[model samples]
Target: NWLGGLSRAAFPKRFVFGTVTSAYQVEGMAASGGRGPSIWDAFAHTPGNVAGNQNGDVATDQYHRYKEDVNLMKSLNFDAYRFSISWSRIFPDGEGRVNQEGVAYYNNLINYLLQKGITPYVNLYHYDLPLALEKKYGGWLNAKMADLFTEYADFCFKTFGNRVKHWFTFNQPRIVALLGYDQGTNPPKRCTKCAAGGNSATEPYIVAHNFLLSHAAAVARYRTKYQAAQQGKVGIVLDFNWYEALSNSTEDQAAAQRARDFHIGWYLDPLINGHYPQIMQDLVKDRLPKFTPEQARLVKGSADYIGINQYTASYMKGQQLMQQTPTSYSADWQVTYVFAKNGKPIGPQANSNWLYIVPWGMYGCVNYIKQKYGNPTVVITENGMDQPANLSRDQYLRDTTRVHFYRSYLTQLKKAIDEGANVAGYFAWSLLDNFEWLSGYTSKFGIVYVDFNTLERHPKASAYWFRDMLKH
Candidate 1:
């Protein structure tokens, strides 16, 4: 009964649906096509950093088979395809001479999509900073990254802006700052005690501040130089996982509010109002960077729309920070996350430890954006669940869980829209299973299955579900 009454007509007539993918996650030829290495390449190749010692050196071979991939989108009846460009590919050193091979590759993909009547929604960054940039100027930790990122973005706008009307400057920067810098779980892996060596408490804030400025500067360049001729919309993508209070107590509720503030408000508030949230300023104080009046003016109103990647929700409860020799960004939250209430799990756990099934959280996430962010135009940029990679090919192809996940989440999304959230589109997290960072290919979050050996893509039942739903 999950898909019994659901139909595209239940939502706005203009609501767009698409399949999402990133450059490193899908494109192989990491070292070829004149493409330089990314931080992910260096991280994955380091022993013990990735599962099964897997690397995306030849992920799905999309760099050579993008035509086939685009045809798959046409068959699925998807109106748009959200893909990202690799910074290292465009500017092998992250800033300098353009790579003609990389430019021609994207040019072919964009032209193919237009020929197939699919709108191209391109994101500039997806956590794959050039290894050269990281080594040269410490990447996002150094303020000089703003000018480099803007220059790279300017090149992209001039080259692809004519065809790609929807642009996202960066995707899930919070993860880049938090997981990479604070937790030391990602590229340029660094933390207070990490083998890579970084100041967890201070580095995360500095990196996040630079990301905001870099995004604002890119948007400024696009508007000033490209908007009149290109007539495109530019925005930023943030990951938002709903935070539900553990109990009805005031302390529990306050913890939930604080968690949300730290998660989304950390970046959104600065972009919207040109300042860090009051809670962050109160807690982080001097560690949190301040925007000068000129920088604030540039950052404020930088986004023409907002993109959210919502997956699951967590229960939050107040926690007393235990003073330690060295503090951290995670420790500064003053909150603990719980996955259950009254001994009952909020929802079924997915393959990824962090993902739990709570379709209603989708409604809360979109509605929160509407209420708190003054109902800015929103796109559900990334939403989907993953499965274990050990499943049999037939079992993986069935994908009943993925179908139910989409139905439940989309149902809630429709509810949010009916309640007046100004959402314009929804893009599933991925179109095919590829490199999944840390977990590597051991986790699958795709509607299309890829054979690691042959690199052949097979559509799951969820693909047909989407194809059928779009027909109505």
Candidate 2:
């Protein structure tokens, strides 16, 4: 039912089809395996915010059951596996000592992926900053973070570059800057209201500046040292949702453009065009960091390709700027994010309230990035919707809606690819339902169901849809 008469034949040759999971989200054994605590480990352990107060103490136990997981991938006919490496796992205290056991486990996974004919797509960081780094240098907020992150990334590039051909430096660095610093909702929670150590007005921008610097430095390192020898591709993962104007009005349209510039432009413009968005420069003024001559050279054209996480859409309208003073990074947007227009919904809602099932958003987003950003190679680093974690076993396994989400979104994505979007690959948000951040295990975004208590894996109906479509 999900396939709905498709067009896999039209996809790019050597197109990548796979599932993605982050280390902190899926891997258990958080404290053991010579793995030091990450910011997530510390944040999730504290009792206040995460749903059901649950952390990834024993999430799906992928650290132990990765072989079983890889077998499932092979059975599903998937071609690739995009997983993140825990920074602390390799250099436990962040930079000095290498953890042999941690290195052994990932080598174990990568060798097995090759063993099973599955390509490994590795991301360097997925918001799992080592607690030691946070404590030592306050993490991404410090300028020194640029060097530290590059050093850590340099280690990964050297160690894992041989076996892994695809490497992403950071997955959604915007979320790391915004949610963690501006909203204070993620690890190392810091905001104006956080009561911790942060200024929502300034820290997010500072953090973003450092993110761009680190991303560029690492790419520069790979290109100079490892790219020729290792023969792998380097990219950065950015999460950019489509922003639609609420109506055909100049005000709303302008606001929509601003949303795009502020969101994706914060990182991408620097990589592609060598500076922050012009609007950002005018609005942020002196608060925004300026790149020196050498910084610009390195930061511009930093990646071989770009990775984007596409999901849902939001209707945009200019906020009543009755107050001229902006409060936080978001406040600087001067735009309101609306979901519905004229009493009609954007689309069906997924279990996660933020996930609205607007298929056209995929087309709009992909095409915009292609046309605007010089038609760079693009991969769907994550594209999936969630269902409730509390569903009955049989109901969850049926997963008719998950099938619907993929088919509809893929069709939209396919339309873009056909129209010359230069789209190259797609990775589903997850392979198995495990520990979701902030919401914990309260939401399931996986095509495969994980019985949290039993640690048993069951492929859902949607998983079969991919298996048949892939035909590997």
Candidate 3:
């Protein structure tokens, strides 16, 4: 009853509310329409990596059903739609030769959204690199990725810049670095002592360095060529948890800050200040890459605004690295995450073990950015929880838990805004329950449930909750 008091009118008039979807996650036709394979295609097609040995070959079939999806968004009263363009779809080989058919698909999608009065916020890369690139240049491992990505993004800016004004260069580059390189949980899966030129100890750092350079290159292109003509804003999406201290001790507090630094500061510090954090410089030392005078100038202040994909928070305690312990990206944080304090849990566990429902984290996260990042324009690019995929249609449609999740977190967000955080827009994690990356379809983050075989969308109670919230 209290949640019903929330409404779209409560927010600033320019504040946008939308849902986000990735090409590989929602758009099917992975093989058809002149689209080339991505690293995700190679990874998921391999057995035992993804749950149920499944892949996103026909994920929700958004390629053919984009009109229906836009209609769905309009019905929900969303101000915008944040969707990713498949790099492989555009440049089948990741460079050279264009796919007219693939270009037509996105053109069709963008035009339909405009016709429906829905703003289109485009993301260029969302963890799905063209497999050709991986084969040709080792993907983000090699420096060539920056130049190629800039060209691809240049194509996108020229083609779509007229209508698509909000842009994200990459979604969660840290995830791209940590998961794919450091942990080897996803594509180009190399970890620990795994291959691809270096061990996990060094590969993620190199990949992260390349991603920053790629982002800078793309942003530079957008600024030089497109911004004056198109007036679009460009930035990268980042995901970092609000690491609260496990105790009030100075050590734990410093440890928590260190975790945040290693997580977001790795990329953001360079982009904001043209260098890595001093703490990182002290510990990582020669292992971390340095920016040249020219590169630092390009990277620093590259973003028009920053996109943050927040989900959960953690309580952290200081940890000492044991002698002879092998160092890696995560270990460099010098911290341990805690979920419980005394007899009480931080919050109830979500479907993902790493996820806990801590609504206050939103307030903490936004305010932290407000103070730490000089109150730059911030966008909540992705923030939503998931449901286990095995539920019956009726059970799935009655998503009160998900609705509560939204309401509680948004309550915190509203408080943050009221207190003066420079947030401009918010996008839910997904628009439809599609193929989750490694989880496949086992976890569903969509407000609308998708019937995999039928490809039908059933709006859950949370959808109605959002509809009502968006309605004045």
Candidate 4:
């Protein structure tokens, strides 16, 4: 088949191949298991929040079809299955009592994967916060929510730490704070203009401060109480997209730096060095949240590695603002994003408008993290292409565009590793085409195509490609 008969297994064993999904995205039975409403429930039911007014009330029915799903993973030759635990499902109301049914479901799922010789990587929260907690205490806005998260983390460690070894704390805290708070994209959707106290830039910072503290508390609890015997790794997943300055102008450079401060620095500086970035403080005017020396110490060195979900790069240019304008720094950073001009050849539109076929962005992202964050052990937790459901019954699932994207990104990742980045593993964006947040079931990011009508999954062309990519 080849001119020289070259093989595909030229890469070393250090590379990891797998796909990822989240509990809320695929797990159906939104109302079952004594589960209270999550923020997603409220958001989806609200008019104009989701497409066609659809919701994940019964997404893929994975609650009942997980065994079949795991079988698909095994068939695909996946080395790991990365997913999350529904906080509402496990603790129903977020705290107080454990839900046996929810626990049993995850337990059975984990056992099945282990029995099939697949690794289970679990994330504690993935945007679906229990409605009870949201109503009772304003979700991430309240400091007490951190305590609730700590309790939930401790409970997970005690219950599932035996089988589930790898743990992630609150996937993409920035997305939760910024998108959920400022842009009102995901949940608890409210503009800072509506409730000045709740939506302001300061609110996300406050929530982020609590989030880091909460992670520290959870990690400390695991180390002191559980990790001694369980021997598991604890870390946090940050969604970092590459940002480029649009021009050589000083203002544009400042805008680019502000973008970094708001996006990556907001979370990373505090987690690694235990303080907010100075640029953030200088621009915000009002005092952003602060951690006491002791709290900073608690947060510092709390992570074993950083999990990054990289997608695209943003070309940033400065916005002309009145010198004395009372604009928040978050507002100043909202410059128009110019998509990459050249890369892995842009093609048909993705399910999400902003997502472009920019594979080089991923490679640059991994390297940027290494240079910026001291090469903390890294993993590509989520990456994939979004397309219409079943539209490409042949091309979509076969996913040549996705294959191009993957091959390009992998090539860059290989270079990053060679250049001394402590890269560990990789997990594709999704395992199945399920409910995509606000877009509902419109977008497909899975390797295996899901038939929403019959809930039947068929391996697409890309699934076969990935399977072969994994085999030696």
Candidate 5:
């Protein structure tokens, strides 16, 4: 019903049609190309870190096979290709000395993508920080790491800004800080208890503060010196999910508000408004760090666009104690979860643990950004879902379920564009199946399928659907 009579071709030529990939996820040769140790390298190699001890050591082998990947994008009629650069790959130690081999690898990839008429949307960092930096100064927890990040950003701009027009500082900044520092789901696997040596909220917030400062500094440097010459757009990507109050009660409403403010506003408030939200401060007390006036000036509204990654909605009923929880490991704030109705079909559930198919949430997210933040240009950075693993059989790749997902989401996107939300572009979650972080190889979120054992690529029906969608 949602996709009935939808305007699929309403978007103009400026609209981007591309798919997403990450360095460690897709680029194999983890040990080659002079790539220094990254958190993922350690995490994946460690026993029980990844499922089946599976690592990205030989992922899609994109590092060597990027030319073929570019051909795939060209065939898909992509206007852009979004990918990340491994920090350690370039600056192996995360500070000084450039790795020519790594630089040449990315240069070859970028040049090939550009030559094929696919615009490159490059991200400076994506969860993989050089292990050297982590060991040296505790990564984001150390303010010195901010300076190092700025250096890395400067190198990228100076080297690649001539051709790449769209640059993203970090892909899901909040996720890296929150999950890597506050929760043990990701690398450096340090939570308040482990990293702080006790159950205190200070560790997560403090580490997050340093990350924000680093992002702000890098952005400010880019805007001040590079923006004028490069004529490029730079922004940070934030992972924003919907939070519905679990019940009609006042406490539930308050709880949902708190959850939204902490997860979304915690990162956004400073960058957009130059200050942290009162909701976070009130809930977390002094544990939530504050920025100095100078830092605020640098941090405030430093983005030309806001890239948003939306997945599913969360139902929050009330604030709860920070007890041992299965889903997460943060002590500063907690909320009771209310499951979505199983039989109502409010949102379609994907095979993944957290994703749901709520297309209207896309509308709500766009409208919220428009009203709340003065309508910043919004790019739907990551959207797509996993299908059953038996994709090779039964044309499951063309499972109309994913087609329905796209049509439903695009309908809301068209509506948002008509509502004056400055909507820019959309990049699907993946181009091909690679290492899916902690889920290992279980979840498949790609339009193309890759045989893990043989490393062969196959185009699914969704790929054909996407190619046709772009043509129209």
Candidate 6:
């Protein structure tokens, strides 16, 4: 229960701990309050896209239950809550007239969060692009998206900036570009060979380029217009999975470095140094977009801080050269991701096939940021594992595995901080089990279990573990 003698007092006094949830994952009033459809709405409706044929049409019913959820966080002794706003809810058709009902819903939620003494950390975009935007202009692929997104962000800053202090411009833009465009697995699915139809070789880079430009535009607006009056810090959230070299061999070591450069450096380099990684420039050739001098100036130093959502690690090896033309972003890296080496598992596997418990990866991830990116302020925006939904309530509520996962990961996080990594805060992946994207309701990531049939909230052992660990 004491988490191996680890507690809140073990870290710096200013470090914040909180839980995170996204709009589509937790807010379930897909059709209520005059909300417009997002790409997820359209993607989930397509047969064979989502497992169990389920969607977030009624996810956790959080739209009408924000007060209750906020109360849950307060009871857990969480100092903050990191949640995303539904862009479609605010602008039904992507841009133009505002939806008052949607505006009022967020207003109520923000008000209640402050009322309960919970700090609000608001994120602007979280994979929920307006269906109208995709239909109108191909979403992130178009250069016009930069302006459209900046307009929406300006509106959010003006409307909610008065209450929300910590702002993330976009959540995991790499995931948006990679999964949505290259892999064609997530919403607005697109790839060279996918049913949605996109160019995998070029589109992913274009999308990522626009995402960086859009982020810089919004941050520019915030710094110029709102920062003086609102006094809130703005940044971006990135998802990084640590890559460990399979061996001490030079090839394997280079492979691991390439993976890190492609994953984190792709977005961060432009923000920090105003250019793409040299490996990307040489490897991608002219396929990768280049920023003009003015654009580079705008993109550089765009973030006040950085938010990293780290989960697992993988062993990396050099990819074999193939004769076929490059098809997707995954192939562009020239690195192979392996879960194990020499018949030994990296760590215990979680319920999800992709997520393996490698607590030490947390240290590697944070330290890599510090060493490569000049030790900027960072926050662990999401760090947790999941279990299968089929487990019985008693078994699910026990959650000994999750408790261990947190203890081990936090211990490693503390080690990084002690070594001088400027990690300012940490937030668990979720507070309640809600709608997982592709897996639907089958994957449970929440510390608190939600009975779908009765909509009752039960704090799992991990929640209590966090409560006890956070006790001053």
Using lDDT as the measure, name the better of candidate 5 and candidate 6. 6
Candidate 4 lDDT tens digits, 90-153:
9878888888999999999999989998899899989899989988898887888668888999
lDDT of 3 at 262: 93
Q: Tell me the lDDT of model 3 at 469.
A: 88
lDDT of all predictions: 0.91, 0.90, 0.89, 0.79, 0.80, 0.92
lDDT of 2: 0.90
lDDT of 3 by residue, 97-126 (tens): 999999999999999999999999899999
Specify the poorest-scoring 10-residue window by lDDT in model 3. Answer: 319-328
RMSD of each: 1.4, 1.2, 1.3, 2.8, 2.9, 1.2
TM-scores of the models, in the given order?
0.98, 0.98, 0.98, 0.93, 0.93, 0.98
Full-model lDDT, candidate 6 = 0.92
Give the TM-score (vs. native) of candidate 1.
Answer: 0.98
Error of 4 at 148 (Å): 0.7
- Badly placed stretches (over 4 Å) of model 6 are 319-324
What ranges in model 3 sit over 4 Å off? 2-4, 195-197, 320-326
What is the model-wide C-alpha lDDT for candidate 4? 0.79
Worst 10 residues of 4 by lDDT: 1-10
TM-score of 2: 0.98
Residue lDDT tens for model 1, 82-158: 99999999889988778999999999999999999999999999999999999999999999989999999999999
Q: How badly does each model clash, as a count of residue pairs?
A: 0, 0, 0, 5, 0, 0
Clash list (residue pairs), candidate 6: none
Task: Give the worst 10-residue stretch by lDDT in candidate 5.
Answer: 323-332
Shift in Å, residue 231, candidate 2? 1.4
- Candidate 6: tens digits of C-alpha lDDT, residues 1-472: 3579888888888789999999999999987788899999999888888888999999899998888889998888899999999999999998998999999999999999999988999999999999999999989989998899999999999999999999999999999888898988996788888877988899999999999999999999999999999999999999999999999988889999999989999988998999999988988888899999999999999998899999999999886534547777889889888887999999988889999999999999999999999998999999999999788999989999999999999999999999999999999998999899999989999999988778788999999998888875
